[PDB]
Nucleic acid binder design. Sequence first.
DNA 1: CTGTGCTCA
Length: 115
Amino acid sequence: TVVEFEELRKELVKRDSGKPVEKIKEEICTKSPPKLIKEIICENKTYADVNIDRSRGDWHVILYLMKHGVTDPDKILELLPRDSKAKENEKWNTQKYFVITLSKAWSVVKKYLEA
DNA sequence: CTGTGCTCA
């Protein structure tokens, strides 16, 4: 689990813009993307704004930051809502949750922008 | 992939 995270996050860090998370929401909220992705980044909502499942609300937001080239485990894990087990640690381990979600979400984007 | 996510089917 943890060793796959080390190689996976290395590929996210080498694709990261190097800017801190405080710039990620700032540069998104000044743009005019669709209300769905913008309102989730620019307000305390996370799924209740679009009435989507909390699993897919996180999935769509994670894919969007990977296309902006600002992906990083620190940003991706911190932006999650209080309804996510990823930071609430209700009972399920967050380390294996991260490896599952990032492995799929990152695989989808990198094959989407490959050349 | 151990809690599931999309896309033209």
